[PDB]
Design an enzyme around this catalytic site. Sequence first.
Site, PDB file in Angstrom:
ATOM      1  N   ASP A  13     -24.932 -44.433 153.921  1.00 46.66           N
ATOM      2  CA  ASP A  13     -24.700 -45.633 154.706  1.00 46.66           C
ATOM      3  C   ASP A  13     -25.845 -46.605 154.467  1.00 46.66           C
ATOM      4  OD1 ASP A  13     -23.764 -47.510 156.560  1.00 46.66           O
ATOM      5  OD2 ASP A  13     -24.407 -46.286 158.347  1.00 46.66           O
ATOM      6  N   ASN A  15     -25.415 -49.726 152.337  1.00 49.31           N
ATOM      7  CA  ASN A  15     -25.294 -50.577 151.167  1.00 49.31           C
ATOM      8  C   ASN A  15     -25.090 -52.059 151.500  1.00 49.31           C
ATOM      9  OD1 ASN A  15     -25.313 -48.345 149.221  1.00 49.31           O
ATOM     10  ND2 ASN A  15     -23.242 -47.932 149.989  1.00 49.31           N
ATOM     11  N   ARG A  17     -25.831 -53.687 154.321  1.00 47.35           N
ATOM     12  CA  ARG A  17     -27.041 -54.188 154.967  1.00 47.35           C
ATOM     13  C   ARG A  17     -28.114 -54.443 153.943  1.00 47.35           C
ATOM     14  NH1 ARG A  17     -29.457 -50.263 159.075  1.00 47.35           N
ATOM     15  NH2 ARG A  17     -27.283 -49.558 158.589  1.00 47.35           N
ATOM     16  N   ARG A  26     -21.612 -57.970 149.393  1.00 45.85           N
ATOM     17  CA  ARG A  26     -21.359 -56.527 149.449  1.00 45.85           C
ATOM     18  C   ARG A  26     -21.091 -55.830 148.133  1.00 45.85           C
ATOM     19  NH1 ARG A  26     -18.639 -57.494 154.041  1.00 45.85           N
ATOM     20  NH2 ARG A  26     -16.627 -56.438 153.626  1.00 45.85           N
ATOM     21  N   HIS A  30     -22.528 -52.325 146.560  1.00 48.20           N
ATOM     22  CA  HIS A  30     -21.676 -51.247 146.073  1.00 48.20           C
ATOM     23  C   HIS A  30     -22.243 -50.762 144.755  1.00 48.20           C
ATOM     24  CE1 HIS A  30     -17.919 -52.445 148.674  1.00 48.20           C
ATOM     25  NE2 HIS A  30     -18.763 -51.656 149.326  1.00 48.20           N
ATOM     26  N   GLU A  60     -17.738 -51.369 157.332  1.00 45.96           N
ATOM     27  CA  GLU A  60     -16.770 -52.465 157.270  1.00 45.96           C
ATOM     28  C   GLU A  60     -15.299 -52.089 157.465  1.00 45.96           C
ATOM     29  OE1 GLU A  60     -15.921 -56.751 156.603  1.00 45.96           O
ATOM     30  OE2 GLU A  60     -17.453 -55.471 157.508  1.00 45.96           O
ATOM     31  N   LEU A 124     -24.258 -28.086 139.159  1.00 47.39           N
ATOM     32  CA  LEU A 124     -24.040 -28.516 140.531  1.00 47.39           C
ATOM     33  C   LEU A 124     -22.550 -28.599 140.870  1.00 47.39           C
ATOM     34  CD1 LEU A 124     -25.356 -29.857 143.095  1.00 47.39           C
ATOM     35  CD2 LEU A 124     -24.857 -32.063 142.009  1.00 47.39           C
ATOM     36  N   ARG A 181     -28.203 -38.134 156.839  1.00 45.57           N
ATOM     37  CA  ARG A 181     -27.494 -39.401 157.044  1.00 45.57           C
ATOM     38  C   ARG A 181     -28.497 -40.555 156.908  1.00 45.57           C
ATOM     39  NH1 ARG A 181     -22.685 -41.795 160.888  1.00 45.57           N
ATOM     40  NH2 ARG A 181     -22.950 -43.978 160.148  1.00 45.57           N
ATOM     41  N   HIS A 186     -27.378 -42.387 164.140  1.00 50.17           N
ATOM     42  CA  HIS A 186     -27.536 -40.958 164.486  1.00 50.17           C
ATOM     43  C   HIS A 186     -26.244 -40.310 164.971  1.00 50.17           C
ATOM     44  CE1 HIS A 186     -32.167 -41.615 165.104  1.00 50.17           C
ATOM     45  NE2 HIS A 186     -31.718 -42.010 163.928  1.00 50.17           N
ATOM     46  N   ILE A 188     -22.444 -38.133 163.418  1.00 46.56           N
ATOM     47  CA  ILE A 188     -21.754 -37.416 162.361  1.00 46.56           C
ATOM     48  C   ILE A 188     -20.520 -38.238 161.940  1.00 46.56           C
ATOM     49  CG2 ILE A 188     -20.445 -35.303 161.813  1.00 46.56           C
ATOM     50  CD1 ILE A 188     -23.515 -35.183 161.791  1.00 46.56           C
TER      51      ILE A 188
HETATM   52  O1  B08 Z   1     -22.823 -48.511 152.924  1.00 47.84           O
HETATM   53  P1  B08 Z   1     -21.719 -49.478 153.589  1.00 47.84           P
HETATM   54  O2  B08 Z   1     -21.075 -48.732 154.864  1.00 47.84           O
HETATM   55  O3  B08 Z   1     -22.286 -50.793 153.975  1.00 47.84           O
HETATM   56  C1  B08 Z   1     -20.366 -49.626 152.309  1.00 47.84           C
HETATM   57  O4  B08 Z   1     -20.897 -50.046 151.051  1.00 47.84           O
HETATM   58  C2  B08 Z   1     -19.583 -48.329 152.086  1.00 47.84           C
HETATM   59  C3  B08 Z   1     -20.332 -47.306 151.225  1.00 47.84           C
HETATM   60  C4  B08 Z   1     -21.099 -46.323 151.844  1.00 47.84           C
HETATM   61  C5  B08 Z   1     -21.694 -45.327 151.077  1.00 47.84           C
HETATM   62  C6  B08 Z   1     -21.518 -45.307 149.694  1.00 47.84           C
HETATM   63  C7  B08 Z   1     -20.745 -46.278 149.069  1.00 47.84           C
HETATM   64  C8  B08 Z   1     -20.465 -46.178 147.706  1.00 47.84           C
HETATM   65  C9  B08 Z   1     -20.445 -47.323 146.917  1.00 47.84           C
HETATM   66  C10 B08 Z   1     -20.168 -47.221 145.557  1.00 47.84           C
HETATM   67  C11 B08 Z   1     -19.909 -45.983 144.978  1.00 47.84           C
HETATM   68  C12 B08 Z   1     -19.930 -44.829 145.755  1.00 47.84           C
HETATM   69  C13 B08 Z   1     -19.701 -43.587 145.164  1.00 47.84           C
HETATM   70  C14 B08 Z   1     -19.387 -42.474 145.937  1.00 47.84           C
HETATM   71  C15 B08 Z   1     -19.172 -41.229 145.355  1.00 47.84           C
HETATM   72  C16 B08 Z   1     -19.273 -41.081 143.974  1.00 47.84           C
HETATM   73  C17 B08 Z   1     -19.593 -42.187 143.194  1.00 47.84           C
HETATM   74  C18 B08 Z   1     -19.805 -43.431 143.784  1.00 47.84           C
HETATM   75  C19 B08 Z   1     -20.211 -44.943 147.115  1.00 47.84           C
HETATM   76  C20 B08 Z   1     -20.163 -47.281 149.841  1.00 47.84           C
HETATM   77  P2  B08 Z   1     -19.211 -50.965 152.901  1.00 47.84           P
HETATM   78  O5  B08 Z   1     -18.056 -51.083 151.787  1.00 47.84           O
HETATM   79  O6  B08 Z   1     -18.469 -50.406 154.215  1.00 47.84           O
HETATM   80  O7  B08 Z   1     -19.964 -52.222 153.115  1.00 47.84           O
HETATM   81  O1  B08 Z   2     -16.161 -55.651 148.131  1.00 49.36           O
HETATM   82  P1  B08 Z   2     -15.970 -55.983 149.698  1.00 49.36           P
HETATM   83  O2  B08 Z   2     -16.541 -54.722 150.519  1.00 49.36           O
HETATM   84  O3  B08 Z   2     -16.637 -57.247 150.085  1.00 49.36           O
HETATM   85  C1  B08 Z   2     -14.129 -56.028 150.015  1.00 49.36           C
HETATM   86  O4  B08 Z   2     -13.499 -56.873 149.047  1.00 49.36           O
HETATM   87  C2  B08 Z   2     -13.530 -54.620 149.940  1.00 49.36           C
HETATM   88  C3  B08 Z   2     -13.695 -53.979 148.560  1.00 49.36           C
HETATM   89  C4  B08 Z   2     -13.157 -54.586 147.429  1.00 49.36           C
HETATM   90  C5  B08 Z   2     -13.318 -54.000 146.181  1.00 49.36           C
HETATM   91  C6  B08 Z   2     -14.019 -52.805 146.055  1.00 49.36           C
HETATM   92  C7  B08 Z   2     -14.553 -52.197 147.185  1.00 49.36           C
HETATM   93  C8  B08 Z   2     -15.281 -51.019 147.068  1.00 49.36           C
HETATM   94  C9  B08 Z   2     -16.034 -50.767 145.927  1.00 49.36           C
HETATM   95  C10 B08 Z   2     -16.787 -49.600 145.841  1.00 49.36           C
HETATM   96  C11 B08 Z   2     -16.784 -48.689 146.890  1.00 49.36           C
HETATM   97  C12 B08 Z   2     -16.031 -48.941 148.032  1.00 49.36           C
HETATM   98  C13 B08 Z   2     -15.993 -48.021 149.075  1.00 49.36           C
HETATM   99  C14 B08 Z   2     -16.385 -46.706 148.865  1.00 49.36           C
HETATM  100  C15 B08 Z   2     -16.291 -45.778 149.897  1.00 49.36           C
HETATM  101  C16 B08 Z   2     -15.810 -46.162 151.144  1.00 49.36           C
HETATM  102  C17 B08 Z   2     -15.420 -47.479 151.357  1.00 49.36           C
HETATM  103  C18 B08 Z   2     -15.511 -48.404 150.323  1.00 49.36           C
HETATM  104  C19 B08 Z   2     -15.281 -50.109 148.118  1.00 49.36           C
HETATM  105  C20 B08 Z   2     -14.390 -52.782 148.437  1.00 49.36           C
HETATM  106  P2  B08 Z   2     -13.820 -56.726 151.718  1.00 49.36           P
HETATM  107  O5  B08 Z   2     -12.228 -56.944 151.845  1.00 49.36           O
HETATM  108  O6  B08 Z   2     -14.202 -55.560 152.761  1.00 49.36           O
HETATM  109  O7  B08 Z   2     -14.586 -57.972 151.948  1.00 49.36           O
END
Ligand code: B08
Ligand code: B08
Lengths: 227, 217
Positions: A13, A15, A17, A26, A30, A60, A124, A181, A186, A188
């Site tokens: 968690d 990314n 922020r 965002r 990612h 999100e 792994l 985490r 804090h 699960i």
């Molecule tokens: O960290 P956040 O909650 O702000 C968010 O990036 C979601 C998110 C949380 C944790 C990890 C990832 C993420 C982003 C890109 C790749 C992966 C990934 C996960 C597992 C294997 C390979 C890659 C995970 C995205 P969000 O899309 O909800 O803004």
């Molecule tokens: O890129 P964002 O987070 O600004 C959005 O386009 C949603 C989205 C679009 C394309 C790709 C992704 C994306 C890319 C990599 C990881 C994830 C992701 C990984 C794990 C949980 C949730 C999201 C999502 C999210 P949003 O509609 O939430 O503004």
Amino acid sequence: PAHGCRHVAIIMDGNGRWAKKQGKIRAFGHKAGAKSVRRAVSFAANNGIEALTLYAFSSENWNRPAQEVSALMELFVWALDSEVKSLHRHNVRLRIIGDTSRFNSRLQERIRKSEALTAGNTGLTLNIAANYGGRWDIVQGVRQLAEKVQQGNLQPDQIDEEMLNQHVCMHELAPVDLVIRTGGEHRISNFLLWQIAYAELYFTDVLWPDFDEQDFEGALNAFANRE
Amino acid sequence: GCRHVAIIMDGNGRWAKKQGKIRAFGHKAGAKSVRRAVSFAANNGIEALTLYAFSSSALMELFVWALDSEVKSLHRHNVRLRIIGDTSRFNSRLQERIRKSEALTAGNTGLTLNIAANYGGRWDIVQGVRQLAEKVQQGNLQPDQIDEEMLNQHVCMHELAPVDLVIRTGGEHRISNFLLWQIAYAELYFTDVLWPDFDEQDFEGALNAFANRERRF
Ligand SMILES: O=P(O)(O)C(O)(Cc1cccc(-c2cccc(-c3ccccc3)c2)c1)P(=O)(O)O
Ligand SMILES: O=P(O)(O)C(O)(Cc1cccc(-c2cccc(-c3ccccc3)c2)c1)P(=O)(O)O
Ligand SMILES: O=P(O)(O)C(O)(Cc1cccc(-c2cccc(-c3ccccc3)c2)c1)P(=O)(O)O
Ligand SMILES: O=P(O)(O)C(O)(Cc1cccc(-c2cccc(-c3ccccc3)c2)c1)P(=O)(O)O
Ligand SMILES: O=P(O)(O)C(O)(Cc1cccc(-c2cccc(-c3ccccc3)c2)c1)P(=O)(O)O
């Protein structure tokens, strides 16, 4: 290994922020998040950890339509397809945990292929949560037991913990010893529940993109000292 | 607003050792800290307080003694007492004392105080499962109709507010098979303070932490 930690689960968690603080959108978080995943996986493989289970927590998902959440599951696991070759080359055994039953058949075939391809690897074991929930996990296992009862093969009274344990995700692997985490929250958040009954819980404010080998080392050492 | 707090009480023996005293001394200090926590929760609008004594016949009589001497005051304070856990194998006199204490206070509308006795989160879930398996055996339920909402109705404390905060004293950072299904969305708060020393200030610090985290996350 010296840290005595066989199976680590991580709630990733922070990314978005992290990107926000940088003045980036965002998608940039990612990408930094993906990079922090690769780094955590190399670290775990290089430190003799037997299994690493990863859960991406989405801060999100409460603003996205349910229709979008399903699709993102597409792209996500889809994306994790070009990556399978790389995991395999690194001798990682891949497993996807979560509810992929509603996923289109093409992707389910892909997941099965990926798991089969890497099943005999000796490095792994990497479990990726996709559409995963701890309560759902317990429920899908309960259902399996409910079928045996309906078959005539199981008496409700014969159901005990040990038996329900055989039907939850990752029961064939070492129990989860440590759950990390990142991101500051804090909770699960309905990640693993049955499986973390005896696990050490480690919370760090570090945002996922910044969580590196030295942060992972700190967590394993806290675990070593705590057990 | 924190409605249901669960506390893993730990550190009595370590506390006694530090004081250079015997185990019984920490038990005594521990009981006083339980009374102060319960008072505090009741005085601050918390709807439910769930307590779990963590430990790594005489206790059975003490259990009877404890119920016999405290239930009246809890009743006067409008507290509803419930024991959670597998008491199916306790001696029948104790089972009966538990049942009467719960019956005496069942209609109170103030704080519900849940005391874990021989409780385990996995066992809790399994007892709910057995209940559902029974209805499947009869024919009142189809395997595929079983969902989260349904099992939720068969785990301990389902009639009370969801657990908002779990506090664990004593320094260990584990759930140790206390609540599992019920803490899916709960805030987890760990403090190194030993149970005998856990006081109003410590309790308030956890509550504040909960409130602040609710605001930021
Ligand atoms: O960290 P956040 O909650 O702000 C968010 O990036 C979601 C998110 C949380 C944790 C990890 C990832 C993420 C982003 C890109 C790749 C992966 C990934 C996960 C597992 C294997 C390979 C890659 C995970 C995205 P969000 O899309 O909800 O803004
Ligand atoms: O890129 P964002 O987070 O600004 C959005 O386009 C949603 C989205 C679009 C394309 C790709 C992704 C994306 C890319 C990599 C990881 C994830 C992701 C990984 C794990 C949980 C949730 C999201 C999502 C999210 P949003 O509609 O939430 O503004
Ligand atoms: O295989 P190694 O141990 O020689 C090494 O590549 C580290 C490593 C071990 C296991 C996996 C990975 C790795 C590399 C690239 C991508 C991923 C990856 C991680 C998660 C999802 C998808 C892909 C993992 C790297 P190193 O950095 O130690 O040379
Ligand atoms: O804290 P520990 O693990 O060192 C130990 O005191 C066990 C213990 C933990 C938490 C609370 C209690 C305890 C002691 C005295 C009274 C109560 C109590 C519990 C519930 C209602 C009323 C009183 C609980 C005992 P132990 O017997 O294992 O040394
Ligand atoms: O106080 P002591 O040291 O004289 C003795 O009663 C031990 C003892 C006394 C009071 C409370 C406890 C105790 C220990 C562990 C758990 C609990 C407990 C209290 C409430 C609910 C569930 C469990 C109580 C143990 P003993 O077993 O040594 O006779």
